[PDB]
């Protein structure tokens, strides 16, 4: 309810591309305006907040000191080289502010593979010594990975946390509600996979016929996500668009799932 005290959410941006913020605002159940006007009090969020500079820093501190507490959403990994100085907001290393916010949060939701597991800046040779949030700070996190995750998964997690408690998590901290099944197990090309009907190239007649993309590097068989079941943007997902899965909800996929166009 708009006029009620709505649960406070503080959203921090660390070493990120903002693709996760962008994914969150693609939500349609509810739309983002309904979420922030009716369901949560979104009290800090750099991409969209009005205040800048000292006024924005004052808004963060007002939120962190709120009597009712707050939930913390983190987007992006933590660069730790040089005392954290390669990623700073308001003159403070990202690792310092995230540590402070995490210490008193009612719950921590890591949106995206970067905050969950370290993500793209952690890929070898990791020049910034980037870490995932739990990796760097040793706090338990609810992880909503993918690059970016489906808004269904993130908003669903937020709503679950506020309404029901912590959802059941897998060994990688991911809610089983969204991450319990392999991409591959729900792929419409699975009969082609079972029959060893694989496209050998993107120009092939096999590709035009919609054959399985395993020989072209598809990581669906080792990736936990709900992509084929829920789709993206109510219209599509990568294999429906003829492209292999990259494994983007898996930890360290940049180094474990590459080369992307091979199984090697």
């Amino acid at each position: 309810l708009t006029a009620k005290h709505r649960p406070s959410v503080v959203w921090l941006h660390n070493a990120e591309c903002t693709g996760c913020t962008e994914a969150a605002i693609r939500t349609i159940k509810p739309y983002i305006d309904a979420l922030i006007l009716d369901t949560i009090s979104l009290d800090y969020q750099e991409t969209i907040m009005a205040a800048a500079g000292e006024a924005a820093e004052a808004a963060l501190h007002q939120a962190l000191e709120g009597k009712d507490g707050y939930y913390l959403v983190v987007e992006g990994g933590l660069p730790t080289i040089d005392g954290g100085q390669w990623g700073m907001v308001a003159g403070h290393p990202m690792i310092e502010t995230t540590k402070k916010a995490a210490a008193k949060a009612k719950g921590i939701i890591c949106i995206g593979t970067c905050s969950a597991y370290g993500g793209v800046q952690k890929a070898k040779p990791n020049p910034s010594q980037a870490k995932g949030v739990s990796e760097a700070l040793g706090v338990k996190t609810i992880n909503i990975p993918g690059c970016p995750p489906n808004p269904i998964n993130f908003v669903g997690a937020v709503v679950h946390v506020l309404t029901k408690g912590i959802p059941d998590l897998d060994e990688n901290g991911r809610p089983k509600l969204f991450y319990g099944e392999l991409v591959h197990d729900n792929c419409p090309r699975l009969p082609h996979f079972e029959a060893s009907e694989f496209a050998p190239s993107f120009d092939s007649e096999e590709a035009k016929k919609g054959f399985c993309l395993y020989e072209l590097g598809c990581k669906g068989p080792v990736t936990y996500n709900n992509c084929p079941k829920v789709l993206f943007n109510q219209v599509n997902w990568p294999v429906q668009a003829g492209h292999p899965c990259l494994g983007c909800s898996e930890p360290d996929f940049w180094d474990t799932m590459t080369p992307f166009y091979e199984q090697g």
Partner: protein, 545 residues
């Protein structure tokens, strides 16, 4: 009548710059209420170029796409053009068409979100909208914009009641400590215009979902598309009738919103801030062009881009030069990189991070400083608009003249923060007017022959460049391949051109120059800094990578 301006003398630091992508600190010296010196200090490094070394060139597009999720897709496209050039494959006509249409869809999504959700709060006092008469607001809307149910007195009253309940709650959320709270001298709009714009801000939150859905029909998903491959595209389904019918329908809805709301709001806001036509100008413009009819090579891209390529120097619209790709280099003298790295063409780019300390005047940004013949270049919609207008591109001549007439200003008034903001809307309208033609072209071609990916072979050694004009401007990716692997991979990104630091000669970048002369009505709430900075549409994850 005159532009508000305090007597403040001293430094102002704004960190974080909010309502941008990524992490930017602006520092300025102010004397008697006007900015006299400025520094653009990017505050995060990730190092994608370092990460790419030794990897499979086919993988580059998937890593570089994650340079940024606001301008999602564009780096996947630049990397794909880059590797296509390096392996010397010419993509099929259907692939050119599909890639360019995904770019068009990205312009629409990106520019709409920028104007409403990133920029508007610099110009629009949302709390003042609570003082508006919704009946007066509806009558005003009826005079300045096409008739629509969303602009009715009932609709505007519902927006106002919702805003009221939210403000009155005392939990102001993203409006907490907004610069316009309690009124601000630099905010000029009548309450009625605030309410119309706020109503559209909310509508735009829903419309951007549709814009992204359109993009995802061809792109696989949004954010971070997954439909490009070396040689072309993978998405055969995107050439078929029913998906393209849905893509057209969604696009038409988004474009109706551009024409009914974005352009009239932009013009109404610009009408009240005509003084901003004299603040924030620069002199040099660069574009690589976009929407080419021949993407078989970078040279063919530059030559056949429908939003044309070119170089303007010293505001001289009488002399558009062709782009010389060999004239591009990047300096690091004032950046957080090791000594020796100045003057590097991107094929010879070096990325050797070396931090010093916050606000070190000798090294103050994680962005490199790209220069062109020793000059800084502004890139983006204003660059594209001036280049097209100077070249006589008929859609740009028509829409630019429409704006100049509405605002009653000469074309020189466009060398400004107001012109930069207007140019973003001008090109959005032009993309919208071209969508149906481009969609029909692909629907017909794809029906005739659904060829979408060309055959190619990886060379042992090669080099290639991929060019695109992304929503924020001229984007280029540059690869050296050795032993069939990435030996060097350099990104030079529009926000690097616009918001990087000084170059080797100590010369201010476009945003640093644009900020000189900025009036500051209240140094505690320096909205004027945000106006100019936001007009460049900064993306720091893009600029630094």
């Amino acid at each position: 009548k005159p532009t508000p301006q305090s007597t403040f003398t001293g430094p102002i630091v704004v960190d974080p710059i909010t309502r941008i992508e990524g992490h930017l600190r602006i520092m300025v010296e102010v004397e008697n209420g006007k900015v006299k010196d400025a520094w653009s200090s990017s505050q995060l490094f990730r190092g994608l170029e370092i990460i790419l070394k030794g990897r499979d060139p086919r993988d580059a597009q998937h890593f570089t796409q994650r340079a940024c999720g606001v301008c999602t897709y564009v780096h996947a496209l630049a990397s794909s053009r880059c590797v296509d050039d390096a392996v010397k494959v010419s993509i099929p006509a259907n692939a050119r068409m599909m890639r360019n249409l995904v770019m068009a869809s990205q312009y629409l999504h990106d520019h709409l979100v920028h104007f409403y959700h990133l920029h508007a709060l610099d110009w629009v006092d949302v709390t003042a909208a609570l003082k508006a008469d919704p009946n007066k607001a509806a009558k005003l809307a009826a005079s300045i914009a096409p008739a629509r149910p969303g602009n009715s007195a009932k609709a505007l009253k519902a927006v106002q009641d919702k805003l009221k309940a939210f403000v009155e709650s005392g939990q102001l959320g993203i409006f907490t400590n907004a610069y316009f709270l309690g009124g601000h001298k630099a905010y000029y709009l009548p309450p009625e215009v605030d309410l119309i714009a706020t109503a559209h801000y909310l509508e735009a939150l829903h419309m951007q979902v549709k814009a992204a859905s359109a993009m995802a029909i061809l792109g696989g998903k949004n954010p971070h598309t997954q439909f490009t491959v070396v040689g072309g595209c993978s998405n055969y389904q995107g050439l078929t009738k029913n998906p393209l019918a849905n893509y057209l329908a969604l696009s038409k809805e988004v474009c109706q919103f551009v024409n009914e709301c974005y352009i009239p709001d932009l013009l109404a806001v610009a009408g009240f801030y005509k003084d901003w036509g004299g603040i924030g100008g620069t002199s040099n413009y660069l574009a690589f062009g976009e929407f080419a009819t021949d993407d078989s090579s970078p040279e063919k891209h530059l030559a056949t881009s429908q939003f044309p390529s070119g170089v303007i120097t010293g505001r001289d619209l009488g002399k558009v030069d062709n782009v010389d790709l060999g004239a591009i280099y990047e300096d690091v003298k004032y950046s957080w990189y090791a000594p020796g790295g100045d003057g590097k063409h991107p094929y010879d780019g070096v990325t050797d991070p070396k931090y010093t300390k916050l606000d070190d005047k000798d090294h103050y940004s994680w962005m490199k400083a790209p220069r062109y013949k020793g000059k800084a270049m502004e890139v983006g919609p204003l660059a594209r608009t001036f280049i097209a207008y100077a070249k006589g591109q008929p859609d740009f001549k028509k829409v630019v003249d429409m704006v100049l007439g509405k605002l009653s200003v000469p074309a020189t008034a466009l060398h400004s923060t107001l012109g930069r903001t207007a140019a973003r809307g001008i090109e959005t309208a032009i993309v919208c007017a071209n969508m149906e033609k481009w969609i029909k072209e692909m629907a017909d071609s794809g029906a005739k022959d659904n060829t979408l990916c060309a055959k190619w072979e990886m060379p042992e050694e090669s080099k290639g460049v991929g060019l695109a004009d992304a929503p924020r401007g001229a984007l280029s990716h540059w690869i050296r391949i050795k032993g069939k692997k990435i030996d060097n991979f350099q990104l030079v990104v529009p926000s690097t051109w616009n918001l990087g630091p000084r170059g080797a000669q100590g010369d201010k970048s476009p945003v640093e120059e644009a900020l000189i002369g900025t009036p500051i009505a209240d140094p505690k709430r320096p909205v004027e800094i945000l106006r100019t900075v936001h007009a460049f549409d900064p993306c720091i994850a893009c600029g630094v990578h």
